Structure 1
Amino acid sequence: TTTLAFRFQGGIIVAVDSRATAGNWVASQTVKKVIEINPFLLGTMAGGAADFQFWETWLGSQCRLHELREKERISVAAASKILSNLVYQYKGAGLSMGTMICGYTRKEGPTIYYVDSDGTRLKGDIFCVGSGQTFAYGVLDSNYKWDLSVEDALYLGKRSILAAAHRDAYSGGSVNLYHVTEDGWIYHGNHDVGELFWKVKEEEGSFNNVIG
């Protein structure tokens, strides 16, 4: 798995891969690793999990209940902490998940929270989680700036997943992009890696190692 999320001028980019494996067996190439929690909050998945389907769908119910009770959109900090406090109760019980709770509110601005099955909860600008995280970090760190256009930022996220999808055996399938403003998240296409690779290779002049 490779999932990333980074803050920038235009809000937040979220990019994930699509592969799920059971050992060396490729189970699915079509996995949605972004739970659309509500219209304003996004959550990612990684780690031999899908525990996070249940719990981030559950989180969406808690966030809905919050804004019914408080007549106000839940903060990214409050939403992330409901999840982190929940998984902390279950600490010790099972396997290894990792997530990024992403959102944009008035009081906070664009915010990303790395929540973890060990109970860790970190606010930050850039995060990469999954077996292919190191590959994604490489592309992201060298090309990241705050002053990135929405177009360029989307591409960087797409390219960072592609980099990991290529090298990491347990990442691949396709890239799901999301862009987050406070008006809501915006979906930006499902991009097959099989087609995206040859497209990027040719246009960018990258991947000269590979023959095409």
Structure 2
Amino acid sequence: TTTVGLVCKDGVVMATEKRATMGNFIASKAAKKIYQIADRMAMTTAGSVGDAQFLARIIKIEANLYEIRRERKPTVRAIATLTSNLLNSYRYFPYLVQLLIGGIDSEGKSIYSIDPIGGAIEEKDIVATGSGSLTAYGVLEDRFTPEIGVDEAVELAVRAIYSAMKRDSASGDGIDVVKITEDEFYQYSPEEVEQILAKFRK
């Protein structure tokens, strides 16, 4: 697993690959690791499949209910705080998961990286997660600039996750990308991604 997230001047970009493993056994070439929480909020999940999936459902349901009840969309801060508390409450038998929750809201643009114990770091620019994160961080910290725009940011994202797939056997098989602009919450589809990494080597 490897997922990245970057806060651009005009939005937010988040991407992950599709591999799921159990040891060296490749259990899945198309695991879903990116979820939509609100209209302009997404979440990437690294860690225990069952734990992440379980938490994802809780996150969604609560975001929904929040809005339906208060007729306001929940801010990423709210969801991040919510999730932190839940994670930390289980600190003595934590959910083995690394979460990335971000998007655009009344407060602005932001991304939160959250660990098993509910420790949340507010990502003001770049962030990678999963077994491949360290390689991904390589290119991200190399080519990133605060003025980067979501459109080239998705290229950058594919770029980083592509490098990571080259040195992390636990990563690979493909890549999902998501752009969160404001006028939209877009998900690139295999074709579009396949054509973006085509300007690289595969």
Query: Residues 10 and 149 of structure 1 are in contact (CA less than 8 Å); yes or no, is this contact kept in structure 2?
Result: yes
Q: What residue in structure 2 maps to residue 143 of structure 1?
A: 143
1:17–1:171 CA contact under 8 A, matched in 2: yes
**Equivalent position of 1:188 in the other structure:** 188
Structure 2 residue aligned with 1:205? none
Kindly indicate whether the alpha-carbon contact (under 8 Å) linking 1:56 and 1:83 is maintained by their aligned counterparts in 2. no
Give the Cα separation in 2 of the matches to 1:95 and 1:165. Answer: 25
Partner Cα separation in structure 2 for residue 120 and residue 174 of structure 1: 29
Deviation for aligned residue 1:196: 7.4
Task: Name the SS of the counterpart of 1:147 in structure 2.
Answer: coil
Query: Per-residue displacement from partner, 1:75-113 (whole Å, max 9, x unpaired)?
Result: 10001111111111111214621010012012x111111
How far apart in 2 are the matches of 1:110 and 1:2? 22
Which residue identity lines up with residue 121 of structure 1 in the other structure? A
Residues 28-177 of structure 1 aligned to structure 2 (within 5 Å): 28-94=28-94, 96-106=96-106, 108-125=107-124, 126-177=126-177
State the percentage of identical aligned residues: 31
Instruction: Count how many residue pairs are aligned between Structure 1 and Structure 2.
Output: 201
Q: Amino acid of the residue matched to residue 121 of structure 2?
A: L
* Gap regions ≥5 residues in structure 1: 203-212
- How much has 1:124 moved relative to structure 2? 1.4
Flag the 1:67–1:198 CA change in 2: closer, same or farther, 3 A.
closer
Q: Partners in 1 of 2:194 and 2:9 — Cα distance?
A: 31
Higher-Rg member (1/2): 1
Shift of 1:50: 3.5
Bigger shift: residues 181-190 or 66-75? 181-190
The 3-state SS of whatever aligns with 2:59 is: helix
Whether the 8 Å CA contact 1:174–1:192 is kept in 2: the answer is no
Letter matched to residue 155 of structure 1: E
Which region of structure 1 is more displaced relative to structure 2, 89-98 or 164-173?
89-98
3-state SS of the aligned residue for 2:118?
coil
Q: Determine helix, strand or coil for the equivalent of 1:77.
A: helix
SS in 1 for 2:54: helix
Aligned-partner SS, 2:200: helix
User: Compared with structure 1, are the counterparts of its residues 12 and 192 closer, same or farther at alpha carbon in structure 2 (3 Å cutoff)?
Assistant: closer
Aligned partners of 1:162 and 1:193 also within 8 Å: no
Q: TM-score under structure 2 normalisation?
A: 0.91
TM-score normalised by the chain length of structure 1? 0.87
Q: CA 1:158/1:68 → structure 2, altered by over 3 Å: closer, same or farther?
A: same
Partner of residue 209, structure 1: none
Q: What letter is aligned with 2:136?
A: A
Segment of structure 1 superposing worse, 142-151 or 17-26: 142-151
| Cα distance in structure 2, aligned partners of 1:4 and 1:50 | 21
| Residues 159 and 197 in structure 2, CA contact (< 8 A), matched pair in contact too | no
CA distance in 1, matches of 2:29, 2:5: 21
Inter-partner Cα distance in structure 1 for 2:33 and 2:196: 19
Structure 2 residue aligned with 1:13: 13
